């Protein structure tokens, strides 16, 4: 991971994916095992490989 | 909380609080509500005090 995109409040992954120019699978692909229903505040997505 | 740890891949709650030194119970009671299978990839756990 080169990049990461910190969870604040409200955030949803359509949102953060869209931000960074990726879609929700990428943002998967990213991330193993995330949960977009159960983001958490502060949770460290990687945004970048 | 005092230190923060960043779950990665695969993480179990029994290694974390291992290679911090303490027993899970301990880490649970850093985190109130804390599911040990279900941990978010990026979550932010707690680690002391």
Same mark, same amino acid.
Not at 8 to 37: E, F, H
């Given at each position: 991971?080169? +990049? @990461? @995109?910190? =969870?604040? +409040? *409200?955030?949803?992954?359509? &949102?953060?994916?869209?931000?960074?120019?990726?879609?929700?699978?990428? #943002?998967?692909?990213?991330?193993? *095992?995330?949960?977009?229903? &159960?983001?958490?505040? *502060?949770?460290? #997505?990687? =945004?970048?490989?």
């Amino acid at each position: 991971c080169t +990049s @990461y @995109y910190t =969870v604040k +409040s *409200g955030d949803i992954c359509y &949102n953060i994916a869209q931000t960074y120019g990726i879609d929700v699978a990428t #943002l998967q692909s990213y991330n193993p *095992g995330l949960q977009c229903d &159960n983001l958490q505040i *502060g949770q460290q #997505l990687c =945004v970048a490989d």
